[PDB]
């Protein structure tokens, strides 16, 4: 059973470029590649991916996300590729990437990463600890995830530069 808005070849489901506002319902549990890139998704429901444990590639880039739910990638233990680039993310929640033991490629760039705020520290430290994982639009580039305003690498940000005072809410 492949979702109506989506084309489906074997275990690949393709919802890219389809003017979508939300993640289609009914993605089969055996999906391994999931293209959701180039849409108008603005949010993700907690647990939207939880049952999709066979995913190896998930493209979420070029949507309009502002925040990620906590735990959103926790079940994705076989995931090797993750694109997050060209969204509107300011931070990544504490521990988003911790269960991602098969990860080899993540794309993070062209997000307004907010390096003035305390919430950025998980990510800046994660990238510091995973210098083989972060790619820009060509190859490996652990500097490609950049601070809005300054355009300096997120990886470089320390506590001394941040304040909880500058986080949302």
């Amino acid at each position: 059973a492949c979702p109506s808005q989506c084309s489906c070849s074997g275990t690949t489901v393709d919802c890219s470029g389809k003017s979508l506002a939300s993640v289609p319902t009914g993605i089969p549990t055996t999906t391994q590649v999931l293209y959701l890139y180039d849409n108008r998704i603005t949010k993700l429901e907690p647990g939207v991916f939880d049952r999709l444990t066979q995913l190896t590639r998930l493209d979420l880039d070029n949507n309009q996300l502002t925040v990620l739910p906590a735990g959103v990638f926790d079940k994705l233990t076989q995931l090797t590729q993750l694109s997050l680039n060209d969204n509107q993310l300011k931070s990544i929640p504490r521990g988003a990437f911790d269960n991602l033991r098969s990860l080899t490629h993540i794309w993070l760039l062209n997000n307004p990463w907010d390096c003035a705020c305390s919430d950025i520290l998980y990510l800046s430290r994660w990238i510091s600890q995973h210098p083989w994982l972060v790619f820009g639009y060509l190859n490996l580039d652990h500097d490609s995830a950049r601070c809005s305003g300054t355009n300096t690498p997120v990886r470089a940000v320390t506590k001394a530069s941040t304040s909880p005072s500058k986080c949302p809410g």
């Binding site: 180039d38 080899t104 060509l138």
Partner: protein
């Protein structure tokens, strides 16, 4: 085709890269040196399934289509093979697409490290 430095500099000036988004000519020559040593047929297979093509090692995940990278976006709208041609036009136009703002050459890490900060116009002199 493996270009000479001068011959490459002239072709890039002809295709309007001199001062493109603030970046003067030697910058583009310098970047091509480190990416491909001026070889238009340079090719590199990546672990993600994509491949890099041409004098500036442009990628098949994002920029060009080679028919063998799934989920590729072809943002430049050329076949990857147009990037292996002895005529650099397509490589230049695709380099123009990649360089969106006045910081867009940061895309080439070897450029950022080996070129930026130096006297890049040396790559243009003597011609």
């Amino acid at each position: 085709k493996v270009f000479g430095r001068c011959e490459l500099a002239a072709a890039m000036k002809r295709h309007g890269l001199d001062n493109y988004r603030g970046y003067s000519l030697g910058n583009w020559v310098c970047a091509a040196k480190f990416e491909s040593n001026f070889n238009t047929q340079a090719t590199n297979r990546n672990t993600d399934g994509s491949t890099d093509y041409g004098i500036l090692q442009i990628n098949s995940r994002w920029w060009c289509n080679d028919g063998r990278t799934p989920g590729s976006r072809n943002l430049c709208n050329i076949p990857c093979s147009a990037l292996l041609s002895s005529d650099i036009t397509a490589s230049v136009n695709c380099a123009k697409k990649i360089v969106s703002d006045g910081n867009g050459m940061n895309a080439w890490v070897a450029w950022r490290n080996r070129c930026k900060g130096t006297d890049v116009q040396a790559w243009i002199r003597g011609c």
